[PDB]
Design a protein around this ligand. Sequence first.
Ligand SMILES: CCCCCCCCCCCCCCCCCC(=O)OC[C@H](COP(=O)([O-])OCC(O)COP(=O)([O-])OC[C@@H](COC(=O)CCCCCCCCCCCCCCCCC)OC(=O)CCCCCCCCCCCCCCCCC)OC(=O)CCCCCCCCCCCCCCCCC
Ligand SMILES: CCCCCCCCCCCCCCCCC[C@@H](O)O[C@H](CO[C@H](O)CCCCCCCCCCCCCCC)COP(=O)(O)OCC[N+](C)(C)C
Ligand SMILES: CCCCCCCC/C=C\CCCCCCCC(=O)O[C@H](COC(=O)CCCCCCC/C=C/CCCCCCCC)COP(=O)(O)OCCN
Ligand SMILES: CCCCCCCCCCCC(=O)SCCNC(=O)CCNC(=O)[C@H](O)C(C)(C)COP(=O)(O)O
Lengths: 88, 104, 220, 67, 62, 80, 178, 124, 175, 459, 128
Amino acid sequence: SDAPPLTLEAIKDRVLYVLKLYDKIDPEKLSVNSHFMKDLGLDSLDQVEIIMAMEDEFGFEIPDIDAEKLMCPQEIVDYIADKKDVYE
Amino acid sequence: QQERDPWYDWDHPDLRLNWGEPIHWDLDMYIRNRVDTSPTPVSWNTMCKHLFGFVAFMLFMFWVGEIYPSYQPVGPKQYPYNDLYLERGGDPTKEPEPVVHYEI
Amino acid sequence: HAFFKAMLFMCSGSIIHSLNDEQDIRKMGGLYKAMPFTTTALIIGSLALTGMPYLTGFYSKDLIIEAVNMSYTNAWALLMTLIATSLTAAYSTRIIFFAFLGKPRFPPLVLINENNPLLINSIKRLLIGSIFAGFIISNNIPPMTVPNTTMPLYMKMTALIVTIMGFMLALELNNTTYYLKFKYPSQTYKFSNMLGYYPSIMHRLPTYHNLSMSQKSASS
Amino acid sequence: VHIEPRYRQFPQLTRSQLIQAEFFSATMWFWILWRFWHDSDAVLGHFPYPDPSQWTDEELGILPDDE
Amino acid sequence: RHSIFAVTHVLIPVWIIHYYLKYHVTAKPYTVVERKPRIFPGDTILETGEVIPLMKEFPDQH
Amino acid sequence: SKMELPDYKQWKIEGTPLETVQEKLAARGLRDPWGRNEAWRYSGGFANNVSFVGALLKGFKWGFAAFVVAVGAEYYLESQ
Amino acid sequence: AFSAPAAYLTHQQKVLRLYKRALRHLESWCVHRDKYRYFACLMRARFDEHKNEKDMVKATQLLRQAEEEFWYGQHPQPYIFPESPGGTSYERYECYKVPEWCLDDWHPSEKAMYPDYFAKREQWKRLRRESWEREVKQLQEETPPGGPRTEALPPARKEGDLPPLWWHIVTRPRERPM
Amino acid sequence: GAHLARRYLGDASKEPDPLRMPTFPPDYGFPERKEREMVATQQEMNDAQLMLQQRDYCAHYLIQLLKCKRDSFPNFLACKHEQHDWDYCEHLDYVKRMKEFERERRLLQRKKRREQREAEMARG
Amino acid sequence: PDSWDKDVYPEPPRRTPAPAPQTSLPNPVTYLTKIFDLLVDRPVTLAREFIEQQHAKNRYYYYHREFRRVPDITECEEKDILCMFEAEMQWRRDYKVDQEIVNIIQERLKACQQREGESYRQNCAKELEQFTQVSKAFQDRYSDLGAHYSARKCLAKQKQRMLAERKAAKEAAAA
Amino acid sequence: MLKIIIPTTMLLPMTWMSKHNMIWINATVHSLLISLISLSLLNQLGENSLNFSLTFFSDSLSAPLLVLTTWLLPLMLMASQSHLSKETTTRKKLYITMLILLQLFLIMTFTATELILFYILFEATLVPTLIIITRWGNQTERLNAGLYFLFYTLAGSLPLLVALVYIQNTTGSLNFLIIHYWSHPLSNSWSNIFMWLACIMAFMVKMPLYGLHLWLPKAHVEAPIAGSMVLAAVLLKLGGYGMMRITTILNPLTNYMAYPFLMLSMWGMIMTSSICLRQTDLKSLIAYSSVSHMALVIVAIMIQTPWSFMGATALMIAHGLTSSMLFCLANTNYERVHSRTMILARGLQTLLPLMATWWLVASLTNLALPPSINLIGELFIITASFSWSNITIILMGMNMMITALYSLYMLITTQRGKYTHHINNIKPSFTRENALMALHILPLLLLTLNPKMILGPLY
Amino acid sequence: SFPKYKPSRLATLPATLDPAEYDISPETRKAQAERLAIRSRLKREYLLQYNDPNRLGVIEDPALIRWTYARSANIYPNFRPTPKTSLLGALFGIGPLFFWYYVFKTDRDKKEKLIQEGKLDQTFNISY
Ligand SMILES: CCCCCCCCCCCCCCCCCC(=O)OC[C@H](COP(=O)([O-])OCC(O)COP(=O)([O-])OC[C@@H](COC(=O)CCCCCCCCCCCCCCCCC)OC(=O)CCCCCCCCCCCCCCCCC)OC(=O)CCCCCCCCCCCCCCCCC
Ligand SMILES: CCCCCCCCCCCCCCCCC[C@@H](O)O[C@H](CO[C@H](O)CCCCCCCCCCCCCCC)COP(=O)(O)OCC[N+](C)(C)C
Ligand SMILES: CCCCCCCC/C=C\CCCCCCCC(=O)O[C@H](COC(=O)CCCCCCC/C=C/CCCCCCCC)COP(=O)(O)OCCN
Ligand SMILES: CCCCCCCCCCCC(=O)SCCNC(=O)CCNC(=O)[C@H](O)C(C)(C)COP(=O)(O)O
């Protein structure tokens, strides 16, 4: 009836979907462990935009202190998974 | 306590206090179930002016409209039996002043 | 009013449940086709609420307006009642415009589902009520009121005219939002949106003074 | 009844709810039209408003300005 | 058991109240007072049989 | 459960007012890199929506037809 | 909520916070998505107009003027996520969160139900007991003699070690305990 | 409404006061006035328990309507002729009140005019 | 019912109109009332008749207590405690009886207002008249004694009122 | 009346000759039996009291107080046997002896026919309570609390002894029946003003009157649970009973000598209700509630009207029961967290739901929810004060608002919000505490069905 | 440029509008570092007892004890009779009493004067 039991792979797929719907990142080089600063050549404002896109994607807010630390898609997936109490 | 950072991991989350830190003298008045001092989008002394002006203007215009009411161009309603003298209380032992209404 | 206002709340709760506890209309998009029964019920409720002719609200609210027009009345109260009648249609239009028309503004995971018999039947009962109860009741209770049989034509249609003007003005100002133009809010908007600053003042000044005198003076 | 989420696609609708919504909207409009056809005076008025100016002085008893 | 709810929740409570009202509330005066029935010109009273006369030769503005 | 995500290459801002916004920005020397993320709200069943007066007149056709047939029946039957 | 805060915010952090806040409030003002895209691109242009200045005084003055701009032009009713500190569902489920130590007060008849879960809980309690002194020793080793300077905690450096002060972080009740 | 606009903005002494009314004798300008008739007696209105504000000169039609509603109870759409008759009598009462208002107004503005005109004659 | 004296609690002759249907549709309340009469009223009547049959097998009476009339406070000396006690008890009983009389008149007034309907203002002038006179008498009797009231204080109030009346008549006859 | 006094006296040899593991059972069972016997005193007449003998009598005002006093001892025994577990047998028996002596003194006080015996027992009640507070109290402030409690009462009531002795010399007797039958007015003299003052302040101190209540927040907080229950439930009502008894001699001097006391009480209810809004201690809040409620009884007694007297009796009974229940509820939490701060243990509805229900019921009863007997008494007094002066309604309504405000504040602070993370020793509610709550609350609701039993002789 | 926001008692100044955070000194940074050190030490001291498996009791908070003691027991020892103290005490203690006494005395005097002339319409007033 309610929302399905969100899993790890679904979170990863949605994060990568949102990331590859972004024009400053190409889909052919985007990886799960590909950092935004050193690997994909982006500045801090683009990182804030990415965090905001993830927030609108999953429908919940990420605190600013926490958001700055994230730098690769794996970090975002792990943060969301631990925040939403997802283990499988 | 509403102004304290809600994203900090306090020892007491609902009170928004840490364990060993000193406690304000008026904590029980600022428990955020109570008096709030958080900044507002509109400044004080401007909220007060607008609210007071609205209330005073409404009262003044209500008084003015009481001075100048709105009605219809009709005569007073007419009731048959001595203006319903018996039905409005009775007192049938005085033979009141007979009021008479005519067709116009 | 009981019928259609309770139905309006049930429709709003159905919307809230179907959008994962989201209550802001700014994150509600195109639900006219996504939730057809909720849209039908809320359209009928808004029409009843706005005193649409022959709706359950027509048998009470329009007669109220007529009585206020045909009485020895405070003129400011009369004008305020008419402006409130227009603002009813104004706000009703806003709920429909920001909730049911346009493109979606909710998160991409679509969990919308109104195919539950309990919700449907509960809304449908008061839908039938909001449609027919005014006619059923108003023609069945004995007359305890002398009517306003003679009225000028322009005053007989005051409520309908003001509701129509409210609809048109609110729709125009809402359609203005699509334009690619940005401007900072005026002071009238801030007064209206912050509830006239009444909670911003009366929930802080008297409470603070009472709680401070209770301790500084009475206790200490 | 069991429908599924769709993730950026229009939700899957059943045949029942569309029929019910159309039926009830049509019922409301039919009721409005029927009542206006049978109770037009409840909206447009039934008794015409008389013009006070049209009334003569003979009806209301006004003297010819001098006695 | 098909209609058991309507017996223990509707019929039983109204049995007690009707008994309570018929023999214990009306045993004392003025406990249950009913508004006087409206009498219109032309009705017949069940208690006395008298007929209320018609209402005085209408002006007939028809 | 066990449902798949749509292909991400089907999201294009073409035809949608996102293209108009992109052109207004290109007239200034800027680009919008998130249009395809928002493009899903304009493509499928959300492509077209009714207007306010068209929403109010949701069931006018069926109601009008029923009213016409009912009034015609009652008019042609009461001729007793 | 998960990271130990620093002593102060740097200029970059303040500018990023202001950028995110201004974008959120502009989205609140711009309800529709394409208009928000247009004005958010304009906002990004306005922020990038001054990203390369090497003078800190003028940058700080620009930041002050930007904060005044935001406070004058902010939305009185900004959008808040439902589970956010200002949301309509912020603390809705805090009365359903029961701490784990309440399970030790159950009757033996209640623990007759769910035997396997209580066996797992017992081995979890044994694991918690067996590691406390090592955590205390690591904490008192890796901190400066004049008290800690930051709230950040160290990880487990050896192989048989668990991160110090982990029990109440690992055994959180849930977001949706019922 | 224009009557309020003329009274509040124009001369207030040229139009009647709704509360202080009428200010002229009922037979001041009329040769003969037939006193208004009441069909329903006091006892009939008492036994019908209409209401105190419903015991006007239209009470007989109201009694008709109440009786017709009572006898044809399940058919709650049959008492239309009596409803129309009662509403027509109410409309007649209202237009009679309008006639009283207009007579009051024009005698009131005529008295002032003639008094000040024969005052204009007495200027010398 | 004969459980109460119908002159202490008067009741109008209860005129009700005849059912004169003028339509052809069935009356739903008639069928509902028939169902009520045959479904709930009859079993209750049967149960009550069984209870009355049980009661008829055991009949006993309780008697209203009657009190003699003892000398009142005016016939008692200043410090005669026994006569004072008996007079005070008799005064308390009379006070309770007066309160119950006022209750009877108030009950009539309430019943009358509801029974008459919408014409109550003119319909029951008599009940209002009866209550006004009874209230005036009860006030002149017991209005301002306050707590710790006694027969002596009521006697003092009566004496003061009699002195006032005598003086009023004194200067009334001098005119 | 000896059929109640003699069993209460026999409670002492039974307590002392009991085995160390059977004292509580015997005491509770026989106290409950004595309460059941005392229930027979509610059968009052309509005109005069029940003159058992030359020494004792019973009226419609003494009977509810006697029933409450007899019913309270089992509850004090129930609430005391938790924190006295580690005591020695002799000390437990001494505590029970003090409680039994207190009951016996109160029982003989509420039925004393003369004012001198009434004074003797009314002051004999001081030594057991003083011993309880200063011996079985928990903190170091119990000595100061005992000193305050003793000296306020004695300083207020020694002039009462002098005045009573003078009255007997001038009148010949102090028997209440003779005084009531042979009543005579006071001339408006300075000597009569001071004799009025001497006969009144002895009971104003124990109500307590506003400004004379300083001893109460000390004595009710420092005392153990049983001491606090008996202080709040019965010992505050001695002043009201004495005032309603002794205003017979006082009239008509009361018509104008009551102005300062009426002003003090009607402003002090506001002051104490406002004090209750900022209290860091729960027990102190419950104690100030008592002053706020008893100011209304002072008003009702001082205005001298039958409706005020009936409302005062009902309010005294209801306040006794409600205050005892609230004190027990606070003690249940104190025995868990070993502190009296209100914000220490919070969110207790999640942990103890049935205690949360008990807290809700007690809070609803405190704020005079209809149709509680609290409401009956308070509304009767409010109507009497409105008849006295219409402007009293402002103060009465403001007091009703503030009472509900602080009652629901106390409920929400303790039972709502999130539970403190570190208090991990909150064991489930015992059967004894739940039974205590039920035995406190059931009589309150049951008395709503027959409110004439607690409306006094003016009914 | 835009209209300026001015703080008040119940609507305080936001941090982003406070000039002190835009004119920073090494003294301020040292102060912030020491404040964070104090908070971190207190947090560590709390969490060491909080996470201890062995302890089964409420953790004592000296700050709460200090707060309650200062608010309740520490007031009189630090009380001095001063002009402001005496004036405020006399006013808040005595003024309301005489105000209400005057109001009630005038009201009851008026009512008694009306009684003695038989003008209150006291019919149906029985229960008083
Ligand atoms: C029948 C014959 C008679 C005919 C009668 C007249 C015929 C038609 C006339 C039509 C006239 C215009 C009607 C529309 C009005 C304006 C609409 C509007 O919203 O414009 C927006 C515009 C600016 O908006 P914004 O800030 O840019 O909005 C930002 C976003 O767009 C925010 O966007 P958003 O998404 O938040 O949406 C905002 C929302 C909300 O919009 C607003 O923010 C403004 C809402 C408030 C104004 C609404 C009108 C209410 C008027 C009530 C007046 C009562 C008296 C108050 C007295 C107070 C005294 C202090 O928009 C709407 O609600 C829709 C507009 C209103 C819909 C209803 C309009 C129709 C009803 C009114 C006309 C009735 C016609 C029939 C009448 C029949 C009987 C006569 O403001 C106005 O135009 C209204 C200003 C008028 C009031 C000014 C009051 C003075 C304030 C300062 C005074 C000096 C104080 C000095 C200090 C004193 C201290 C003591
Ligand atoms: C902290 C609170 C604790 C409780 C306090 C209780 C308060 C007790 C006070 C009781 C009030 C009545 C006492 C005296 C009665 C009237 C006082 C005076 O103001 O009345 C006038 C009296 O005039 C003068 O004021 C004389 C009194 C002057 C001496 C008294 C000064 C008291 C001021 C401060 C009192 C402090 C009380 C607390 C002590 C610790 C009336 O004038 P007059 O009609 O001609 O005389 C009537 C008396 N007769 C009939 C016997 C002849
Ligand atoms: C916790 C604080 C409470 C303190 C209360 C103290 C005040 C009590 C009230 C006054 C107490 C003393 C009154 C005397 C006892 C009654 C005696 C009596 O009634 O007889 C009078 C005696 O009258 C007196 O002698 C009065 C003496 C008063 C002197 C002591 C004054 C003490 C202070 C008075 C004010 C205190 C009252 C209120 C204070 C409240 C607390 C602040 C009649 O005298 P006769 O001999 O008959 O002469 C007339 C015929 N020839
Ligand atoms: C309601 C609507 C509110 C609108 C009002 C607000 C509008 C403000 C517009 C102007 C903003 C300014 O001047 S803000 C001034 C911006 N420039 C500086 O601060 C100087 C050095 N620049 C940097 O450090 C980087 O650009 C940095 C930004 C940190 C990112 O970089 P990373 O990410 O690589 O780290």
